[PDB]
Design a binder for this molecule. Structure first.
Ligand SMILES: *[C@@H]1O[C@H](CO)[C@@H](O[C@@H]2O[C@H](CO)[C@@H](O[C@@H]3O[C@H](CO)[C@@H](O)[C@H](O)[C@@H]3O)[C@H](O)[C@H]2NC(C)=O)[C@H](O)[C@H]1NC(C)=O
Ligand SMILES: *[C@@H]1O[C@H](CO)[C@@H](O[C@@H]2O[C@H](CO)[C@@H](O)[C@H](O)[C@H]2NC(C)=O)[C@H](O)[C@H]1NC(C)=O
Ligand SMILES: *[C@@H]1O[C@H](CO)[C@@H](O[C@@H]2O[C@H](CO)[C@@H](O)[C@H](O)[C@H]2NC(C)=O)[C@H](O)[C@H]1NC(C)=O
Length: 419
Protein backbone atom coordinates (compact mmCIF):
# COMPACT_ATOMS: atom_id res chain seq x y z
CA UNK A 1 0.00 0.00 0.00
CA UNK A 2 0.89 3.68 0.46
CA UNK A 3 0.79 4.53 4.21
CA UNK A 4 2.21 2.67 7.20
CA UNK A 5 0.43 -0.03 9.19
CA UNK A 6 -1.32 2.13 11.77
CA UNK A 7 -1.02 -0.51 14.50
CA UNK A 8 2.76 -0.23 14.83
CA UNK A 9 2.80 3.47 13.93
CA UNK A 10 2.74 6.06 16.73
CA UNK A 11 1.12 9.51 16.95
CA UNK A 12 4.52 10.93 15.96
CA UNK A 13 3.56 9.85 12.45
CA UNK A 14 0.40 9.63 10.31
CA UNK A 15 -0.71 13.30 10.29
CA UNK A 16 -4.24 13.16 11.69
CA UNK A 17 -6.04 16.50 11.50
CA UNK A 18 -9.66 16.83 12.70
CA UNK A 19 -11.17 19.96 11.16
CA UNK A 20 -12.57 20.60 14.64
CA UNK A 21 -10.85 20.37 18.01
CA UNK A 22 -12.56 20.05 21.39
CA UNK A 23 -9.84 21.39 23.72
CA UNK A 24 -2.12 8.31 38.68
CA UNK A 25 -5.29 6.19 38.98
CA UNK A 26 -3.51 2.81 39.41
CA UNK A 27 -3.21 1.55 35.83
CA UNK A 28 -2.00 -2.10 35.63
CA UNK A 29 1.63 -2.77 34.77
CA UNK A 30 2.31 -3.45 31.08
CA UNK A 31 -0.41 -1.13 29.79
CA UNK A 32 -0.79 1.52 27.08
CA UNK A 33 -1.86 4.58 29.04
CA UNK A 34 -3.76 6.03 26.11
CA UNK A 35 -5.70 2.91 25.13
CA UNK A 36 -6.51 2.25 28.79
CA UNK A 37 -8.10 5.68 29.19
CA UNK A 38 -10.05 5.43 25.98
CA UNK A 39 -11.44 2.16 27.30
CA UNK A 40 -12.27 3.73 30.65
CA UNK A 41 -14.37 6.04 28.46
CA UNK A 42 -16.27 3.35 26.56
CA UNK A 43 -17.11 1.48 29.76
CA UNK A 44 -18.70 4.65 31.08
CA UNK A 45 -20.90 5.13 28.04
CA UNK A 46 -21.62 1.41 28.43
CA UNK A 47 -23.13 1.20 31.92
CA UNK A 48 -24.67 4.63 31.40
CA UNK A 49 -26.43 3.65 28.21
CA UNK A 50 -27.32 0.23 29.61
CA UNK A 51 -29.09 1.67 32.64
CA UNK A 52 -30.98 4.26 30.59
CA UNK A 53 -32.14 1.53 28.20
CA UNK A 54 -33.03 -0.76 31.08
CA UNK A 55 -35.45 1.88 32.44
CA UNK A 56 -37.30 1.92 29.14
CA UNK A 57 -37.62 -1.89 29.08
CA UNK A 58 -39.48 -4.07 31.58
CA UNK A 59 -37.64 -6.05 34.26
CA UNK A 60 -38.96 -9.18 32.50
CA UNK A 61 -37.38 -8.57 29.11
CA UNK A 62 -33.99 -9.74 28.00
CA UNK A 63 -31.54 -7.00 27.00
CA UNK A 64 -28.54 -7.01 24.71
CA UNK A 65 -26.43 -4.43 22.93
CA UNK A 66 -22.74 -3.81 22.13
CA UNK A 67 -21.61 -0.58 23.77
CA UNK A 68 -18.28 -0.92 21.96
CA UNK A 69 -19.96 -1.19 18.57
CA UNK A 70 -21.92 2.04 19.08
CA UNK A 71 -19.11 3.96 20.82
CA UNK A 72 -17.04 3.01 17.76
CA UNK A 73 -19.62 3.78 15.08
CA UNK A 74 -20.34 7.22 16.54
CA UNK A 75 -16.66 8.02 17.07
CA UNK A 76 -16.49 7.69 13.28
CA UNK A 77 -19.33 10.17 12.95
CA UNK A 78 -17.41 12.58 15.17
CA UNK A 79 -14.32 12.26 12.95
CA UNK A 80 -15.69 15.26 11.09
CA UNK A 81 -18.21 16.78 13.49
CA UNK A 82 -18.09 20.26 15.04
CA UNK A 83 -19.46 22.68 17.63
CA UNK A 84 -22.51 21.31 19.44
CA UNK A 85 -22.69 18.40 16.98
CA UNK A 86 -19.42 17.47 18.70
CA UNK A 87 -19.56 18.70 22.28
CA UNK A 88 -22.63 16.50 22.56
CA UNK A 89 -20.82 13.49 21.11
CA UNK A 90 -17.84 13.96 23.42
CA UNK A 91 -20.19 14.42 26.38
CA UNK A 92 -22.64 11.63 25.60
CA UNK A 93 -19.84 9.14 24.99
CA UNK A 94 -17.74 10.21 27.97
CA UNK A 95 -14.78 11.15 25.78
CA UNK A 96 -14.55 14.37 27.81
CA UNK A 97 -13.82 12.44 31.01
CA UNK A 98 -10.26 11.59 29.99
CA UNK A 99 -7.01 13.52 29.44
CA UNK A 100 -6.98 16.22 26.80
CA UNK A 101 -4.20 14.09 25.31
CA UNK A 102 -6.51 11.12 24.78
CA UNK A 103 -9.68 13.20 24.36
CA UNK A 104 -7.88 14.78 21.40
CA UNK A 105 -6.38 11.91 19.46
CA UNK A 106 -9.44 9.71 20.07
CA UNK A 107 -9.35 8.35 16.51
CA UNK A 108 -5.73 7.37 16.90
CA UNK A 109 -6.30 5.43 20.12
CA UNK A 110 -9.47 3.94 18.73
CA UNK A 111 -7.35 2.68 15.88
CA UNK A 112 -4.89 1.18 18.37
CA UNK A 113 -7.71 -0.52 20.26
CA UNK A 114 -9.13 -1.90 17.02
CA UNK A 115 -5.67 -3.26 16.29
CA UNK A 116 -5.31 -5.33 19.48
CA UNK A 117 -9.03 -6.11 19.01
CA UNK A 118 -9.53 -7.46 15.50
CA UNK A 119 -6.13 -9.09 14.86
CA UNK A 120 -6.27 -12.79 15.69
CA UNK A 121 -5.29 -16.17 17.05
CA UNK A 122 -8.44 -16.87 15.01
CA UNK A 123 -8.89 -19.99 17.07
CA UNK A 124 -12.50 -20.70 17.98
CA UNK A 125 -12.29 -17.10 19.13
CA UNK A 126 -13.28 -14.79 16.28
CA UNK A 127 -14.61 -11.22 16.50
CA UNK A 128 -15.89 -9.45 13.38
CA UNK A 129 -16.86 -5.79 13.16
CA UNK A 130 -19.28 -4.20 10.69
CA UNK A 131 -19.57 -0.45 11.34
CA UNK A 132 -20.08 1.85 8.33
CA UNK A 133 -21.48 5.21 7.15
CA UNK A 134 -23.90 5.52 4.21
CA UNK A 135 -24.60 8.90 2.62
CA UNK A 136 -26.29 9.86 -0.64
CA UNK A 137 -24.30 10.00 -3.89
CA UNK A 138 -25.55 13.54 -4.55
CA UNK A 139 -22.77 14.85 -2.28
CA UNK A 140 -19.00 15.18 -2.46
CA UNK A 141 -17.41 13.71 0.66
CA UNK A 142 -14.18 15.18 2.01
CA UNK A 143 -11.44 12.78 0.89
CA UNK A 144 -9.35 13.55 3.98
CA UNK A 145 -12.18 12.07 6.02
CA UNK A 146 -12.48 9.12 3.66
CA UNK A 147 -8.81 8.25 4.02
CA UNK A 148 -8.47 8.72 7.79
CA UNK A 149 -11.52 6.49 8.29
CA UNK A 150 -10.22 3.64 6.17
CA UNK A 151 -6.99 3.80 8.14
CA UNK A 152 -8.43 4.27 11.63
CA UNK A 153 -11.71 2.39 11.27
CA UNK A 154 -11.10 0.88 7.87
CA UNK A 155 -14.26 1.44 5.91
CA UNK A 156 -14.48 4.98 4.58
CA UNK A 157 -17.91 6.45 3.93
CA UNK A 158 -20.13 4.82 1.35
CA UNK A 159 -22.30 6.65 -1.15
CA UNK A 160 -25.61 5.08 -2.06
CA UNK A 161 -28.48 6.35 -4.17
CA UNK A 162 -31.01 7.05 -1.45
CA UNK A 163 -32.96 9.83 -3.20
CA UNK A 164 -33.78 7.68 -6.20
CA UNK A 165 -33.13 4.08 -5.06
CA UNK A 166 -33.92 3.71 -1.36
CA UNK A 167 -35.13 0.10 -1.36
CA UNK A 168 -32.15 -0.78 -3.50
CA UNK A 169 -29.70 1.02 -1.23
CA UNK A 170 -31.44 -0.66 1.72
CA UNK A 171 -30.66 -4.03 0.16
CA UNK A 172 -27.13 -2.76 -0.48
CA UNK A 173 -26.51 -1.79 3.12
CA UNK A 174 -28.27 -4.92 4.33
CA UNK A 175 -26.36 -7.22 1.97
CA UNK A 176 -23.17 -5.62 3.26
CA UNK A 177 -23.74 -6.40 6.93
CA UNK A 178 -25.18 -9.88 6.32
CA UNK A 179 -21.76 -10.36 4.83
CA UNK A 180 -19.21 -9.17 7.35
CA UNK A 181 -21.26 -11.16 9.88
CA UNK A 182 -20.96 -14.41 7.90
CA UNK A 183 -24.56 -14.31 6.75
CA UNK A 184 -25.52 -14.19 10.42
CA UNK A 185 -26.70 -10.60 11.07
CA UNK A 186 -29.58 -10.44 8.61
CA UNK A 187 -31.88 -7.47 7.86
CA UNK A 188 -30.05 -4.67 9.65
CA UNK A 189 -32.21 -1.91 8.19
CA UNK A 190 -35.96 -2.72 8.03
CA UNK A 191 -38.25 -1.70 5.18
CA UNK A 192 -39.47 1.89 5.32
CA UNK A 193 -36.53 2.83 7.55
CA UNK A 194 -34.91 4.50 4.58
CA UNK A 195 -36.75 6.58 1.99
CA UNK A 196 -35.85 9.02 -0.78
CA UNK A 197 -35.34 11.58 2.00
CA UNK A 198 -32.56 9.69 3.77
CA UNK A 199 -29.36 11.73 3.93
CA UNK A 200 -26.83 9.99 6.16
CA UNK A 201 -27.23 6.53 7.63
CA UNK A 202 -25.25 4.85 10.38
CA UNK A 203 -25.02 1.08 10.76
CA UNK A 204 -22.97 -0.82 13.38
CA UNK A 205 -22.87 -4.42 14.61
CA UNK A 206 -20.35 -6.77 16.18
CA UNK A 207 -20.23 -10.52 15.73
CA UNK A 208 -18.59 -13.01 18.10
CA UNK A 209 -18.08 -16.74 17.49
CA UNK A 210 -16.34 -18.73 20.20
CA UNK A 211 -15.92 -21.96 22.12
CA UNK A 212 -15.78 -22.35 25.86
CA UNK A 213 -12.28 -22.98 27.11
CA UNK A 214 -14.21 -25.36 29.33
CA UNK A 215 -17.29 -26.67 27.49
CA UNK A 216 -20.31 -28.21 29.19
CA UNK A 217 -21.22 -31.85 28.61
CA UNK A 218 -24.59 -32.11 26.81
CA UNK A 219 -25.29 -35.22 28.90
CA UNK A 220 -25.34 -32.96 31.97
CA UNK A 221 -27.72 -30.38 30.49
CA UNK A 222 -31.18 -30.74 31.99
CA UNK A 223 -34.70 -29.38 32.18
CA UNK A 224 -35.00 -27.22 35.29
CA UNK A 225 -37.00 -24.27 36.58
CA UNK A 226 -35.93 -20.71 35.84
CA UNK A 227 -37.78 -18.22 38.02
CA UNK A 228 -38.68 -14.98 36.25
CA UNK A 229 -39.10 -11.58 37.92
CA UNK A 230 -42.92 -11.63 37.72
CA UNK A 231 -42.88 -14.51 40.21
CA UNK A 232 -43.87 -16.95 37.46
CA UNK A 233 -41.40 -19.68 36.58
CA UNK A 234 -40.65 -21.69 33.46
CA UNK A 235 -38.59 -24.62 32.16
CA UNK A 236 -35.12 -24.06 30.70
CA UNK A 237 -32.27 -26.24 29.48
CA UNK A 238 -29.90 -25.98 32.44
CA UNK A 239 -26.30 -26.79 31.58
CA UNK A 240 -24.04 -28.32 34.23
CA UNK A 241 -20.32 -28.25 34.91
CA UNK A 242 -17.87 -28.52 37.79
CA UNK A 243 -14.37 -27.11 37.75
CA UNK A 244 -12.19 -24.25 38.95
CA UNK A 245 -13.52 -20.86 37.81
CA UNK A 246 -12.80 -17.28 38.79
CA UNK A 247 -15.52 -16.50 41.30
CA UNK A 248 -16.49 -13.71 43.65
CA UNK A 249 -19.35 -13.34 46.08
CA UNK A 250 -19.78 -9.62 46.57
CA UNK A 251 -22.22 -7.36 48.45
CA UNK A 252 -25.56 -8.84 49.50
CA UNK A 253 -24.87 -12.29 48.13
CA UNK A 254 -24.50 -11.22 44.50
CA UNK A 255 -22.17 -13.68 42.76
CA UNK A 256 -19.77 -12.88 39.91
CA UNK A 257 -18.77 -15.84 37.75
CA UNK A 258 -16.34 -15.77 34.81
CA UNK A 259 -16.29 -18.33 31.99
CA UNK A 260 -13.44 -17.76 29.48
CA UNK A 261 -13.43 -18.63 25.78
CA UNK A 262 -10.62 -20.53 24.02
CA UNK A 263 -7.87 -17.94 24.27
CA UNK A 264 -8.58 -16.28 27.61
CA UNK A 265 -8.77 -12.92 25.89
CA UNK A 266 -12.54 -12.97 25.68
CA UNK A 267 -14.81 -14.08 28.49
CA UNK A 268 -18.40 -13.98 29.61
CA UNK A 269 -18.94 -12.52 33.06
CA UNK A 270 -22.16 -13.28 34.92
CA UNK A 271 -23.48 -10.99 37.67
CA UNK A 272 -26.06 -13.07 39.56
CA UNK A 273 -27.97 -11.51 42.52
CA UNK A 274 -29.28 -13.87 45.23
CA UNK A 275 -32.80 -15.36 45.01
CA UNK A 276 -34.51 -12.52 46.94
CA UNK A 277 -32.60 -9.40 45.82
CA UNK A 278 -33.78 -7.68 42.61
CA UNK A 279 -31.59 -7.30 39.56
CA UNK A 280 -32.97 -3.79 39.28
CA UNK A 281 -31.06 -2.60 42.35
CA UNK A 282 -27.83 -4.17 41.12
CA UNK A 283 -28.35 -2.61 37.71
CA UNK A 284 -28.83 0.81 39.37
CA UNK A 285 -25.74 0.25 41.50
CA UNK A 286 -23.71 -0.52 38.37
CA UNK A 287 -20.84 1.91 37.79
CA UNK A 288 -17.60 1.39 35.80
CA UNK A 289 -15.48 1.35 38.94
CA UNK A 290 -17.77 -1.07 40.80
CA UNK A 291 -17.57 -3.51 37.91
CA UNK A 292 -13.79 -3.11 37.89
CA UNK A 293 -13.48 -3.71 41.63
CA UNK A 294 -15.49 -6.91 41.20
CA UNK A 295 -13.42 -8.11 38.26
CA UNK A 296 -10.13 -7.68 40.07
CA UNK A 297 -11.50 -9.28 43.26
CA UNK A 298 -12.09 -12.45 41.26
CA UNK A 299 -10.27 -15.57 42.42
CA UNK A 300 -10.10 -18.97 40.79
CA UNK A 301 -12.26 -21.40 42.74
CA UNK A 302 -13.56 -24.96 42.61
CA UNK A 303 -17.31 -24.74 42.15
CA UNK A 304 -20.50 -26.38 40.88
CA UNK A 305 -22.27 -24.41 38.08
CA UNK A 306 -25.83 -24.37 36.70
CA UNK A 307 -26.23 -22.15 33.62
CA UNK A 308 -28.98 -22.28 31.01
CA UNK A 309 -28.90 -22.24 27.21
CA UNK A 310 -30.21 -18.94 25.91
CA UNK A 311 -30.32 -16.39 23.16
CA UNK A 312 -30.76 -12.70 23.80
CA UNK A 313 -30.68 -10.13 21.02
CA UNK A 314 -31.94 -6.82 19.75
CA UNK A 315 -32.12 -4.68 16.65
CA UNK A 316 -31.68 -1.12 17.88
CA UNK A 317 -32.78 2.31 16.64
CA UNK A 318 -30.34 4.28 18.77
CA UNK A 319 -31.58 7.62 17.43
CA UNK A 320 -34.35 7.55 19.99
CA UNK A 321 -32.39 6.44 23.07
CA UNK A 322 -29.25 8.50 22.31
CA UNK A 323 -30.88 11.87 21.76
CA UNK A 324 -33.03 11.06 24.77
CA UNK A 325 -29.67 10.82 26.53
CA UNK A 326 -28.61 14.19 25.15
CA UNK A 327 -27.40 13.47 21.63
CA UNK A 328 -29.41 16.09 19.71
CA UNK A 329 -27.80 18.22 16.97
CA UNK A 330 -26.41 15.20 15.11
CA UNK A 331 -29.93 13.94 14.39
CA UNK A 332 -31.27 17.42 13.56
CA UNK A 333 -30.98 18.74 9.96
CA UNK A 334 -31.05 22.30 11.28
CA UNK A 335 -28.70 21.99 14.25
CA UNK A 336 -26.24 19.28 13.09
CA UNK A 337 -22.80 20.21 11.80
CA UNK A 338 -20.47 17.73 10.10
CA UNK A 339 -18.24 19.96 7.94
CA UNK A 340 -15.77 17.09 8.06
CA UNK A 341 -17.84 14.94 5.70
CA UNK A 342 -19.47 17.51 3.41
CA UNK A 343 -18.78 21.21 2.86
CA UNK A 344 -22.45 21.75 1.88
CA UNK A 345 -23.17 19.83 -1.34
CA UNK A 346 -26.98 19.75 -1.14
CA UNK A 347 -27.17 21.47 2.27
CA UNK A 348 -27.38 20.31 5.90
CA UNK A 349 -25.75 16.92 6.41
CA UNK A 350 -26.98 14.93 9.40
CA UNK A 351 -27.44 11.36 10.60
CA UNK A 352 -30.93 10.42 9.44
CA UNK A 353 -30.86 7.26 11.54
CA UNK A 354 -28.50 4.79 13.25
CA UNK A 355 -29.11 1.05 13.27
CA UNK A 356 -27.78 -1.40 15.88
CA UNK A 357 -27.94 -5.19 15.96
CA UNK A 358 -26.29 -7.62 18.35
CA UNK A 359 -27.16 -11.06 19.63
CA UNK A 360 -25.74 -13.79 21.83
CA UNK A 361 -26.60 -17.48 21.76
CA UNK A 362 -24.88 -19.59 24.41
CA UNK A 363 -24.85 -23.37 24.86
CA UNK A 364 -22.66 -26.30 25.86
CA UNK A 365 -20.11 -25.59 23.10
CA UNK A 366 -19.71 -21.82 23.31
CA UNK A 367 -21.00 -18.65 21.70
CA UNK A 368 -22.61 -19.28 18.33
CA UNK A 369 -21.43 -22.89 18.43
CA UNK A 370 -22.74 -26.40 17.75
CA UNK A 371 -26.26 -26.63 19.17
CA UNK A 372 -27.34 -30.05 20.47
CA UNK A 373 -30.73 -31.75 20.40
CA UNK A 374 -30.48 -34.89 22.53
CA UNK A 375 -33.82 -34.95 24.39
CA UNK A 376 -33.17 -33.03 27.59
CA UNK A 377 -33.74 -35.26 30.61
CA UNK A 378 -35.57 -33.92 33.64
CA UNK A 379 -34.69 -33.50 37.28
CA UNK A 380 -31.35 -33.11 39.00
CA UNK A 381 -30.45 -34.64 42.34
CA UNK A 382 -28.55 -32.33 44.72
CA UNK A 383 -24.77 -32.41 44.35
CA UNK A 384 -23.34 -33.67 47.63
CA UNK A 385 -20.29 -32.13 49.29
CA UNK A 386 -21.17 -28.67 47.86
CA UNK A 387 -24.04 -26.35 46.88
CA UNK A 388 -23.91 -24.55 43.55
CA UNK A 389 -23.89 -21.33 41.54
CA UNK A 390 -27.30 -21.32 39.85
CA UNK A 391 -28.39 -18.85 37.20
CA UNK A 392 -32.06 -19.83 37.63
CA UNK A 393 -33.15 -16.19 38.04
CA UNK A 394 -32.38 -12.96 36.08
CA UNK A 395 -28.66 -12.29 35.77
CA UNK A 396 -26.43 -9.77 34.08
CA UNK A 397 -24.08 -10.76 31.26
CA UNK A 398 -20.91 -9.14 29.90
CA UNK A 399 -18.74 -10.28 26.97
CA UNK A 400 -15.35 -8.71 27.62
CA UNK A 401 -11.99 -8.43 25.88
CA UNK A 402 -9.69 -8.88 28.87
CA UNK A 403 -6.31 -7.61 27.62
CA UNK A 404 -7.87 -4.31 26.46
CA UNK A 405 -10.36 -4.34 29.35
CA UNK A 406 -13.17 -3.52 26.94
CA UNK A 407 -16.86 -4.40 27.28
CA UNK A 408 -17.80 -5.76 23.83
CA UNK A 409 -21.25 -6.99 24.77
CA UNK A 410 -23.51 -6.49 27.77
CA UNK A 411 -27.05 -7.66 28.39
CA UNK A 412 -29.59 -9.26 30.71
CA UNK A 413 -30.99 -12.76 30.66
CA UNK A 414 -34.36 -12.13 32.30
CA UNK A 415 -36.10 -14.99 30.51
CA UNK A 416 -34.28 -17.74 28.58
CA UNK A 417 -37.22 -20.14 28.49
CA UNK A 418 -38.64 -22.24 25.67
CA UNK A 419 -39.21 -20.00 22.63
C1 LIG B 1 -11.19 17.61 5.06
O1 LIG B 1 -11.46 17.43 6.46
C2 LIG B 1 -10.27 17.51 7.28
C3 LIG B 1 -10.68 17.16 8.69
O2 LIG B 1 -11.65 16.12 8.70
C4 LIG B 1 -9.61 18.91 7.13
O3 LIG B 1 -8.38 18.94 7.90
C5 LIG B 1 -7.67 20.13 8.09
O4 LIG B 1 -6.48 19.76 8.82
C6 LIG B 1 -5.66 20.89 9.18
C7 LIG B 1 -4.37 20.34 9.77
O5 LIG B 1 -3.43 21.37 10.00
C8 LIG B 1 -6.41 21.77 10.15
O6 LIG B 1 -5.56 22.86 10.57
C9 LIG B 1 -5.90 23.64 11.68
O7 LIG B 1 -4.68 24.11 12.28
C10 LIG B 1 -4.91 25.02 13.38
C11 LIG B 1 -3.56 25.49 13.86
O8 LIG B 1 -3.65 26.76 14.49
C12 LIG B 1 -5.72 24.33 14.49
O9 LIG B 1 -6.04 25.28 15.50
C13 LIG B 1 -7.02 23.73 13.92
O10 LIG B 1 -7.67 22.96 14.93
C14 LIG B 1 -6.72 22.84 12.71
O11 LIG B 1 -6.02 21.68 13.11
C15 LIG B 1 -7.67 22.30 9.45
O12 LIG B 1 -8.45 23.06 10.36
C16 LIG B 1 -8.52 21.14 8.89
N1 LIG B 1 -9.57 21.68 8.04
C17 LIG B 1 -9.70 22.99 7.86
C18 LIG B 1 -8.89 23.63 6.74
O13 LIG B 1 -10.44 23.69 8.55
C19 LIG B 1 -9.32 19.18 5.64
O14 LIG B 1 -8.80 20.49 5.48
C20 LIG B 1 -10.61 19.02 4.82
N2 LIG B 1 -10.34 19.23 3.41
C21 LIG B 1 -11.21 19.91 2.66
C22 LIG B 1 -11.00 19.87 1.15
O15 LIG B 1 -12.15 20.55 3.13
C1 LIG C 1 -19.48 27.18 15.87
O1 LIG C 1 -20.00 28.15 16.79
C2 LIG C 1 -19.38 29.45 16.66
C3 LIG C 1 -19.94 30.33 17.77
O2 LIG C 1 -21.23 29.88 18.19
C4 LIG C 1 -19.65 30.01 15.26
O3 LIG C 1 -19.08 31.33 15.13
C5 LIG C 1 -19.95 32.34 14.71
O4 LIG C 1 -20.57 31.92 13.48
C6 LIG C 1 -21.50 32.89 12.96
C7 LIG C 1 -22.18 32.25 11.75
O5 LIG C 1 -23.40 31.62 12.12
C8 LIG C 1 -20.76 34.18 12.60
O6 LIG C 1 -21.67 35.14 12.10
C9 LIG C 1 -20.06 34.73 13.85
O7 LIG C 1 -19.27 35.86 13.49
C10 LIG C 1 -19.17 33.65 14.50
N1 LIG C 1 -18.64 34.12 15.77
C11 LIG C 1 -19.29 35.03 16.49
C12 LIG C 1 -18.71 36.44 16.52
O8 LIG C 1 -20.33 34.78 17.10
C13 LIG C 1 -19.03 29.07 14.23
O9 LIG C 1 -19.30 29.54 12.92
C14 LIG C 1 -19.63 27.66 14.41
N2 LIG C 1 -18.97 26.75 13.49
C15 LIG C 1 -19.59 26.34 12.38
C16 LIG C 1 -19.56 27.27 11.18
O10 LIG C 1 -20.17 25.25 12.30
C1 LIG D 1 -20.45 -10.09 1.01
O1 LIG D 1 -20.96 -11.23 0.28
C2 LIG D 1 -19.95 -12.21 -0.11
C3 LIG D 1 -19.69 -13.12 1.08
O2 LIG D 1 -20.45 -14.31 1.00
C4 LIG D 1 -18.69 -11.52 -0.65
O3 LIG D 1 -18.17 -12.29 -1.77
C5 LIG D 1 -17.67 -11.57 -2.85
O4 LIG D 1 -18.78 -11.13 -3.64
C6 LIG D 1 -18.37 -10.21 -4.67
C7 LIG D 1 -19.63 -9.73 -5.37
O5 LIG D 1 -20.50 -9.08 -4.46
C8 LIG D 1 -17.35 -10.88 -5.62
O6 LIG D 1 -16.86 -9.93 -6.54
C9 LIG D 1 -16.18 -11.48 -4.81
O7 LIG D 1 -15.32 -12.22 -5.68
C10 LIG D 1 -16.70 -12.40 -3.70
N1 LIG D 1 -15.61 -12.93 -2.90
C11 LIG D 1 -14.82 -12.13 -2.18
C12 LIG D 1 -13.69 -11.42 -2.91
O8 LIG D 1 -14.96 -11.97 -0.97
C13 LIG D 1 -18.99 -10.04 -1.05
O9 LIG D 1 -17.81 -9.42 -1.56
C14 LIG D 1 -19.47 -9.26 0.18
N2 LIG D 1 -19.97 -7.94 -0.18
C15 LIG D 1 -21.23 -7.71 -0.58
C16 LIG D 1 -21.54 -6.29 -1.03
O10 LIG D 1 -22.11 -8.57 -0.60
Amino acid sequence: GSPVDICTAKPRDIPMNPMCIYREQKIPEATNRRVWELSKANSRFATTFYQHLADSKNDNDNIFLSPLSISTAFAMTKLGACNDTLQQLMEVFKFDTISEKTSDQIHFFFAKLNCRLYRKANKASKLVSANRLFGDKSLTFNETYQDISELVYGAKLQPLDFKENAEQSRAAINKWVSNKTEGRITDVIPSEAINELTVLVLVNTIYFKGLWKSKFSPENTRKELFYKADGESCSASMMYQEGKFRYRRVAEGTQVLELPFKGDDITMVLILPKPEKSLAKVEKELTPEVLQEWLDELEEMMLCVHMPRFRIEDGFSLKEQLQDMGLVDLFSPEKSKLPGIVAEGRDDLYVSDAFHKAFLEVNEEGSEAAASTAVVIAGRSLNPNRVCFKANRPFLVFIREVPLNTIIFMGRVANPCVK
